[PDB]
Amino acid sequence: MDIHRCRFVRYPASAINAVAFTHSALPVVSSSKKYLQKNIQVRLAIGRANGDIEIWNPLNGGWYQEVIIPGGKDRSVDGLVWVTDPDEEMADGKIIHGKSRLFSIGYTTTITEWDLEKARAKKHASGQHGEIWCFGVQPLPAAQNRKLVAGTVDGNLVLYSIEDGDLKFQKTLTRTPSKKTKFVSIAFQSHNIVIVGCSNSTICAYDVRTGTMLRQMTLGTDLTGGSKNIIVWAVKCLPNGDIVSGDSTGQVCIWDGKTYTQAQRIQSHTQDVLCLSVSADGSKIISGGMDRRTAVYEPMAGQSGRWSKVFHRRYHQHDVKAMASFEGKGMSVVVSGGSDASPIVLPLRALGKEFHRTLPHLPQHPTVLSAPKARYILSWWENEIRIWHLLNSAQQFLPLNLRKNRKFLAQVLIKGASHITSASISEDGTLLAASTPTDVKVFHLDPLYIKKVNMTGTGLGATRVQISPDKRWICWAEEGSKVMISRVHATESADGISYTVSVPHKLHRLRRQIPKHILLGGLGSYDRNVSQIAFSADSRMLSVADLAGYIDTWVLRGPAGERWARNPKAAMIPKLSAAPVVLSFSPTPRDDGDYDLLVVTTLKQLLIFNPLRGMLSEWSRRNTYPKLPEPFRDTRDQVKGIVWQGQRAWFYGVASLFMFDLSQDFSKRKRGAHESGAGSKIEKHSLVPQRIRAASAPDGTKWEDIEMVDGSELQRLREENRAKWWHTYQFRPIMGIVPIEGIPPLEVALIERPLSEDDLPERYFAEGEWER
Amino acid sequence: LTALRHRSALREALQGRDELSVINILRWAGKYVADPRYRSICVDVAFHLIDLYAEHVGGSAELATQFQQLLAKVNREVEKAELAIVTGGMVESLMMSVE
Amino acid sequence: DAIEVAGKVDDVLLTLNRLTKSSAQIIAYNSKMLATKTGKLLHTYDESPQSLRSVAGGRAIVAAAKEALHIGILKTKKLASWEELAYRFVSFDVPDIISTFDIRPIIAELQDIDVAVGGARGAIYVYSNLLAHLHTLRVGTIQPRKYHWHRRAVHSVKWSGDGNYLISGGYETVLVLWQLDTGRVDFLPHLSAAIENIVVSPKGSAYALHLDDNSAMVLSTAEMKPSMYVSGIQSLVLGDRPSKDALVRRVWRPIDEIASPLVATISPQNPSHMFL
Amino acid sequence: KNPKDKRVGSTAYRVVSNGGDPRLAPKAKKQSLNLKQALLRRDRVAKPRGGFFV
Amino acid sequence: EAVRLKGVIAEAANYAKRARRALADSAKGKAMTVHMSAELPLGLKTDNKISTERVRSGGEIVARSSRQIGHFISKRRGIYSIHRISEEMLLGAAGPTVVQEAR
Amino acid sequence: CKERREIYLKFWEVGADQSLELVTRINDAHYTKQTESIFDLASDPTSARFATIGNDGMVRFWSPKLRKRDGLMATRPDGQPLRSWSCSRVVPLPVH
RNA sequence: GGGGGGAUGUCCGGGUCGCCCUGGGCACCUCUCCCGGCAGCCUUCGCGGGCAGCCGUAGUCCCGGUUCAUACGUCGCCGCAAUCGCGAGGGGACCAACGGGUAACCGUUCCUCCAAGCGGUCGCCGGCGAGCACCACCCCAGCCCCGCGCCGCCCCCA
Helix, strand or coil: CEEEEECCCCCCCCCEEEEEECCCECCCCCHHHHHHHCCCCCCEEEEECCCEEEEEECCCCCCEEEEEEECCCCCCCCEEEEEECCCEECCCCCEECCCEEEEEECCCCEEEEEECCCCEEEEEEECCCCCEEEEEECCCCCCCCEEEEEEECCCCCEEEEECCCCCEEEEECCCCCCCCCCEEEEEECCCCEEEEEECCCEEEEEECCCCEEEEEEECCCCCCCCCCCCCCCEEEECCCCCEEEECCCCEEEEEECCCCEEEEEEECCCCCEEEEEECCCCCCEEEEECCCEEEEEEECCCCCCCEEEEEEECCCCCCCCEEEEEEECCEEEEEEECCCCCCEEEECCCCCCECCEECCCCCCCCCEEEECCCCEEEEECCCEEEEEECCCCCCCCCCCCHHHHCCEEEEEECCCCCCCCEEEECCCCCEEEEECCCCEEEEEEECCEEEEECCCCCCCCCCEEEECCCCCEEEEEECCCEEEEEEEEEEEECCEEEEEECCCEECCCCCCCCCHHHHHCCCCCCCCCEEEEEECCCCCEEEEEECCCCEEEEEEECCCCCEEEECHHHCCCCCCCCCEEEEEECCCCCCCCCCCEEEEECCCEEEEEECCCCEECHHHHHCCCCCCCHHHHCCCCCCCEEEECCCEEEEECCCCEEEEECCCCCCCCCCCCCCCCCCCECCCCCCCCCCEEEECCCCCCCEEECEECCCHHHHHHHHHCCCCEEEECCCCCEEEEEEECCCCCCEEEEEECCCCCCCCCCCEECCCCCCC | CHHHHHCCCHHHHHCCCCHHHHHHHHHHHHHCCCCCCCHHHHHHHHHHHHHHHCHHHCCCHHHHHHHHHHHHHHHHHHHHHHHHHHHHHHHHCCCCCCC | CEEECCCCEEECEEEEEECCCCCEEEEEECHHHHHCCCCEEEEEECCCCCEEEECCCCCEEEEECCCEEEEEEECCCCCCCCCCCCEEEEEEECCCCEEEEEEEEECCCCCEEEEEEEECCCEEEEECCHHHHHCCCEECCCCCEEEECCCCCEEEEEECCCCCCEEEEECCCCEEEECCCCCCEEEECCCCCCEEEEEECCCCCEEEEEECCCEEEEEECCCCCCCEEEECCCCCCCCCCCCCCCCCCECCCCCCCCCCCCCCEECCCCCCCEEC | CCCCCEECCCCEECCCCCCCCCCCCCCCCHHHHHHHHHHHCCCCEECCCCCCCC | CHHHHHHHHHHHHHHHHHHHHHHHHHHHCCCCCCCCCCCCCCCCCCCCCCCCEEECCCCEEEECCHHHHHHHHHHHCCCEEEEECCHHHHHCCCCCEEEECCC | CCCCCCCCEEEEEEECCCEEEEEEEECCCCECCCECCEEEEEECCCCCCEEEEECCCCEEEEEEEECECCCCECECCCCCECEEEEEEEEECCCCC
16 A cells, blocks of 8 residues: 555535534433434434535434535525424324424525425525625524514515425515614514614614514724624523624623513623523523634522633634534533634533533535546636546656646536536546536546537536546436436547446335435435445446445346346345445455455444345454444544445545455443543543542541532354454545555555634734734 | 833734844844844844744855844954954053052 | 540640651640650641641531642531541542642631632642532542642742632732632732741731741731831751742752852941941 | 616616525625624734735 | 854754754654755754643643644644554554655 | 853942942943953942952052032032042952 | 663674674663652651652543633823934935846835924923713714625627
8 A cells, every 4th residue: 555645636615604403402301212302313414604504413423424515606505404303203103303403594585495305495485675684583482474584684574384395475574773783683582572783882682572672782892993883693591581692892791581670791702792692591601703712601509690700711713703503312511613614513411520522514525536547636616626637656756746746637617607516527537427406417538638528418517427437327306315327338439438327227216114204304315425336346236325324235137238227135134223424335346246245334334235135244244333443433533435345445535544354353531431423531630520439437547528519142153154454544634535546556645634724714903912 | 122022022012023124124123243242132133033044045045145244243252252352362461560 | 736635625636747758647736645745646647747727616627748739627516525526538630730729718617718829830729619529439520720820939828808809929929819899910029039938817918928038028018018017147058948939840940959158248338237 | 686677767687686695595694794804803913913914 | 263163063963962963853753844865954943742731822832732833743744654553553562664754 | 142141230328318329330340351250249338439350350449529510519409529449450460 | 761671673894604692873762760740648847758650642421622810090282391203205335135137227125314294201389170071862964894786998709
């Protein structure tokens, strides 16, 4: 293995503008109702300043980046709202969960509901007014009659309906009297009492029924100097009735709600507050701001309505633009997103008791491709595809010549304003394919010269795209869930090779067996969108897997009489316990004509199929998950991908690396301890104490420890049917590990993306706050 | 500058500069070595800027010329200090010839 | 302290005496019990003991270990007989290296206590309700409120009268005052030396500081002006108690030493005076 | 972009323009975006961006 | 003339000694930025091995954790580098061969 | 640091309110190729004369005079003349 | 760093020629104790001592990749005393350096004179005026900034 590290691929970051849990909390049950609370679909939606809305699954500490949908050019986001109905009970007591609808704002007069099943924007709805600068749903007491409230720049509170799957602007509640007031932060103290922080240093309290004005709260001048408008950056409501609001001086104010007047001011940050969070029981307060710094606050014992800061700390490296908190199924967390592209999640109930978690700033898909025969590396973003050729091996160099060794070869820019979802290349690099949510396009390349192979039959885009290794099949995940393939024919002529695509042929996925209440509740027909696709090394077998854990495979029957039929053993292929993150055929062929399918799911579940037998390989029957090594079992790192060897497989997450010998069998992070869904516990220096020793017996020799709390037969058979593994974390920001040629030896490109202040936006300072 | 050597933060004061900033500071230095009344403090700062911004003299040749125009006064600053002592001996035993 | 043995309140003396170097023991004495020089052994603890204070009366005592703290709560009430003088103890580790501390007793009973503790990292942990948190085997999750301002060691931390201000001072010659009702700080910023010690008047009126250059200043509140001023010889002293920042391995560890004799001249024409 | 209108002086002949966003996403308003940007950046100054460069 | 060339040969010998130190550590495999061509770097500077001590507030010092040490070797890494693993690494015995682009 | 030693000498007057006031400051009281660490100081018990020895090896004798450049006497604005000490004598020392 | 070893790879006499070795070159892993600190735990008030000690190097499940900064009390005007500076503009040297041009030479930076004028610091046993107010509310014009439409010019194809 010869490795080439790379940092010249400037994958641009984007400022997270929205963090949004699909639930703020779940009602707490014991262990005996876990079977009831199992099928609750809980996710986290995030919006970044390139208009990218991405959904992750918490997975009780997993945080698998499920889907990324990017928006077009000059398209950002700033807000995000989930709309979950209360839970339904069927006629026989079966539970239908609340269908959670997703809404966003695209810095327009328009609010956009998004469809994640077809993976695009579902609906827009626009009123004739200014531009919306905060919005949210009316809370729950009505039952089926819920509404959307949106405040804007001119002021006028616009009111939308959300029921019967409709998104229509109804009417204006009220506009500000002044023409100089901007509505900047929204919250709801009651079902019908709305509290909005607003640019002219006000927090206006309205009632939504007749659009009336309860009260106004005032904020002074910033005695930090000029700019005598205070900007009420955030408002949040305590569940008991009090109101808290973060502001422009970095202060935070606490307001009694039954009279809507301030009981207390706290001077916390030095520059502005940008976001707040409250514990789901209404106990802890979190304040994150552009001093790249965030604090937590508790109620004072004794005196009512008085709170104080417990502490503060810098977690991020840029501001903390948005956040969202969750407290459910034993996981109390808050996710904070800013502009350094790295989400940071914190425990709520174990704050100061467990370490945080820096999620990968880079996307789940590696977004790096290689034609190893051509030694071409590939990376796409907003409209362009960028290609480098390496033109040399590593043993030739084994300083001054590595600069000529790498080369910025090519850069193509897509037309229109869409974004490249995915891309595929042929093994020799002569065929390129770019997939947008609007269309898919192919480009033939001659070593450059690029021509546009035009696609017929499409017109609706696709989510995933693969090209067969023999350069005959092009398959795509169209609209997430719709797998569809077209043959391409390579006709030679005196100028060279040319390629004509046939009609897209549809291949019907298998009718899976899901109960109707599960099909309706949650996000509905959602996980059916697929995440991973694979042709065999000879492109005779196709296999696809979704976010649910289902895998549908297909065989290619020859007589162009070639057509793909269903593999009958796909029925015997069972559904995975988790979402498969990586799947790949073995390029080393078997001896019985079957294939060997290596799959890893997001619980790091490693296994291998003999799919024509419809069963696991015997090596997977032997090596179990308890047989797996602990540095792979404890990673807290979703496996970004695999590269193959003859008898080895080299795995990589985002910060981790492994190699395993698939021929051989196999024989710090704690396991039985129970935490929140982020980080390990503290060991050395935590604000909570660790050893609490009571002392009876006045000689001090007798003490106490006061706790601080609020297949044997199967392995017999699997051994009667009858190491080389390695790991490191010495390549932290891995964004791509792609093979190239020129147990066999292979060259490989390890491209990373460290974050710098140069990539980062710049920090603005007035005279007072000048950081040391 | 006496204050920033006395409270020891000249190194902090100069280690974070940019191209144009060291252009200005070098221009001040090259202007003001020639006064011996603060030549010591100035050459301390000159030592520090040598330690801190000699790397990109090839990356930015206009600053290399400024690095040169540092010398381009200094090569005659040897002659001022030397001819000082050349004159410095011319006085001392004419005083001895008095007695 | 002053406690009621049967019906008479008298002075009890609590002596913290080392038994090894890394351990010590606390022993209570009456007047007659100190005369007979026998004592009531209350607690021995084994982590490099520093100090001990107690509340008014004798309900609660507090021993300062290096990283932990021991709290003794008198088991019986009203103290009928002398011999039933027993204190329930729980130990627990402060996250920083303890330099000093103060307590306000939340009160005609003793309903609670609130303890501020200062450490040489430059930090103040205030614990809100220790008696209610440790009266309840199992206890709830305790967490102090953090207060970091000073870079070097903090030396002297106390409460302001009705306890609304966390008053303090240390090495960096700034009398610092945590606001504790809002997020602000108020400081009398430039003293002549490191703040060795802070003490409070019986009323909330008069502060008195001992300052590292052998000095003492008694001020009145919000006047902050020298209302009583005393200074001493200010000489270089070999410190009995060595230093409060000599605990966490600074770049230069300050060492009690005298490398040169002192420079001084008596004034002629006025031999009653001397410059030094 | 949208084709500009052709006036006879009195009447405005316009081709209607609705082909930009088929299903993708609404195009953001950079004007309001700059408003929010300056409203953050009220009167402050930034830092020197990188290190040693022209 | 002797003092002029006194200065230059003094600094040349000093930088050559520190370069012996750095290339000894690079042959060990500590991956420092040292020169590769036969000409003098204009900056007479070498990448020292990372100070295991970390200075904290106010003046206290704790040892550098391996996490920040890896952060520091990462920032010392360059834009493009061939980092060849050995089978002696794969069994766990020896180290890699690193060649970064000449910066 | 032994090069970058900085050694001030300051002459002061004192008022009967124990006031210490500057009259002069000399930066270089003992100088050869680099500065000379000044070794000792002594007062004439009968006259306003201060002798001092440094690493130069010379002992220097300083006496206060009246600030008067070219007949114009420099008086403090209350009227009193400005006094200023000066190296009245220099004595080199023979070495063995 | 030394003193030393076991082992990796290497050339020159080489050896029946192989295990490698002696003679020269050696770089490394390892072990060894003597260098510098760091901890704990007993000892003695301390001075000191003892005890089993780690580290002098590299990439982590997450993660300290952190936590940290020094006051109000009053401002404005202009006058005196000591003290320094910038210089508009008008003059000299052509020293040096740079970049072009062989060169001549040019240009740029610099060195220096004279100076209109101008500030800045401390001490004013100077004077003089004024303290919310350099604010609230509102409105009209204005500099900047940014957004789009209209023209003006230049485009090309035509």
